[PDB]
Amino acid sequence: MASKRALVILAKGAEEMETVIPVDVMRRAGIKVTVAGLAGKDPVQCSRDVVICPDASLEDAKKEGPYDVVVLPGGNLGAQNLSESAAVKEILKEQENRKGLIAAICAGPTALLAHEIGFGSKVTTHPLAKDKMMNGGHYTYSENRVEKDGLILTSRGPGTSFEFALAIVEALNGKEVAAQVKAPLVLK
Amino acid sequence: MASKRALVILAKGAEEMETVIPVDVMRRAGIKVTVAGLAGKDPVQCSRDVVICPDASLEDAKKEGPYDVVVLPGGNLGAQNLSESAAVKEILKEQENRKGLIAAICAGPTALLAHEIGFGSKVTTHPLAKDKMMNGGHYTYSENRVEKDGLILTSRGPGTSFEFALAIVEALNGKEVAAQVKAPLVLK
Secondary structure (H helix, E strand, O other): OOOOEEEEEEOOOOOHHHHHHHHHHHHHOOOEEEEEEOOOOOOEEOOOOOEEEOOEEHHHHHHHOOOOEEEEOOOHHHHHHHHHOHHHHHHHHHHHHOOOEEEEEOOOHHHHHHOOOOOOOEEOOOHHHHHHHOOOOOOEEOOOOEEEEOOEEEEOOHHHHHHHHHHHHHHHHOHHHHHHHHHHHOOO | OOOOEEEEEEOOOOOHHHHHHHHHHHHHOOOEEEEEEOOOOOOEEOOOOOEEEOOEEHHHHHHHOOOOEEEEOOOHHHHHHHHHOHHHHHHHHHHHHOOOEEEEEOOOHHHHHHOOOOOOOEEOOOHHHHHHHOOOOOOEEOOOOEEEEOOEEEEOOHHHHHHHHHHHHHHHHOHHHHHHHHHHHOOO
C-alpha cells in the first residue's frame, strides 16, 4: 500500500559513506527516507569532513513517525553521540516496542548497547568495535558481513554498506525489489 | 614531500555515493581533498537528494591549483552539468597538459568526451553510458571495473567506487598506502 519510511539519524562524526550509501540505496528502492540531524537542522560535519545538510532535525522528525526502519550509521564519534542521546534512546525503544526494524552499521550497533536494545540477538560490528559491543555479554557476536536476527540488522564497515542497505531493502520491500535495485549498481 | 592534492568537482545531480566514497577514501590516504561546487559555494542537491556542502566554489578552487588528481563523479545529470562547463573544460585541459591524473566514474567519463580529453585511451563507464562515451570512436571501451590507461583512470558505478578510489590512492601514494587504507574498510 503506502511507501515504506526510513529514519536515518545523522550525528557529528558519522561515517559519511555509511550515511550516504544507505540513504541513496533506500531511495532507489522507493523508500521515503528522512535524514534527521541529531543536533538540529544545521549541516553535519562527518568523520572525513564531508558536510551533509539533513532533511530535518531529529526533534521534528521524531514527531512524524512511525518509521518502518530506524538506521544508525557508524563512525566512532557519531556512534558515541548516538549513544549519549536520550532522544535516540526513546526512538529506539519505541521502534523495538512496535516490532519495527532497527539497522546499525560499523560502530553504530554500540548505540544499541548503550540504549539496552535487542539484547540476546546475534550482531556484527566493525572488528574494532567488537569489544565495546560485547561488554557484558548481552549479544552473541557474528563475523557475517551483514547479520539479521529478527528485527536487529547489523553490518561491519564502509565496505559492507551496500550489502547492509540492500538487506534493509529486502526486509522492507522484498527480495525482488532488492535484486532490481542491486543490478544497476555494478556491485561485484 | 608535500601531501598530494585532489580536486573533486561537485555538480547538481551528481551521484552522492560516487562523490563521498572517493572523498572519504582519499582523505583516509592523507590526500588533501577539495570538494568544489561547480555552481558556487552553496549546498549541492545530489541525484538521490543528499545535500552536500562544498568546501569551496570551483571558481575559487580552480585558482588554487595545481592538483595531483581531478576527480569527476558520475550521476547522469551531474555529468551533463560537468560536460557543459567551460570552467571544467579549462581545468581538464590544463591537467592533461601538465600530465596530471584525471579520474572519472560511471557517467563521469562522458565529460572527458565533451571536453575532448584523453582520446585514444582505453576507458570504462557505466554500461548505460557506453554509447554516449563511444560516440565517434574516440576511446576504446573496457569492461574492467576500474580501467587506467596512463593518466586517464575510469570506473563503472556506485559499486565500483571503493575500487576506483583505492586506484586513485595507489596512483598517487603507492600500493602499500592503498593496501593500508583498504584493510579497515571491510571490503569483500
